[PDB]
């Protein structure tokens with residue numbers, strides 16, 4: 001399947017988000033080596049990452065960090081923020097379908113339930129954890145990279 005360099009896609013997403021949240025002054029740092037790529041449908045990668053990155057910008061206090069690594073069959077994108085995080089007791093239910101009635105602000109994404117379902121199409125998943133900053137750590141994993 002087609003190969004998509006990750007850095008440029010994340011750059012496109014950040015740029016769009018920097019606008020939506022320009023008033024908040026979120027500082028988004030990226031550590032994505034140039035060779036890291038995503039194998040699959042570009043829009044799938046962007047829908048998942050757009051939802052996770054929008055959440056980080058929305059809930060952070062100021063800092064958001066994005067990093068990535070890849071192995072032979074998997075791609076790992078980690079998004080960390082310095083916000084309140086996701087309570088231990090909620091790191092499960094946030095991936096289930098909820099009452100998302102008209103929450104369609106122009107920057108809203110597909111939601112985490114749908115984002116996880118997309119990663120599962122690639123034999124992947126999304127793991128909710130805690131960052132060093134104490135806020136959320138979301139690790140997005142896509143499989144089927146070989």
Ligand SMILES: Nc1ncnc2c1ncn2[C@@H]1O[C@H](COP(=O)(O)OP(=O)(O)NP(=O)(O)O)[C@@H](O)[C@H]1O
Nearest residue numbers: 051055056059081083085086094100111112113136
């Ligand atoms: N980075 C984060 N920091 C704190 N809470 C988060 C974070 N990411 C997700 N959540 C929580 O998980 C919930 C569901 O995620 P998601 O499915 O993206 O929400 P949504 O319905 O699309 N609305 P929104 O939280 O504006 O993205 C959110 O409403 C938050 O309560």
Ligand SMILES: [Mg+2]
Nearest residue numbers: 051109110111
């Ligand atoms: Mg969302």
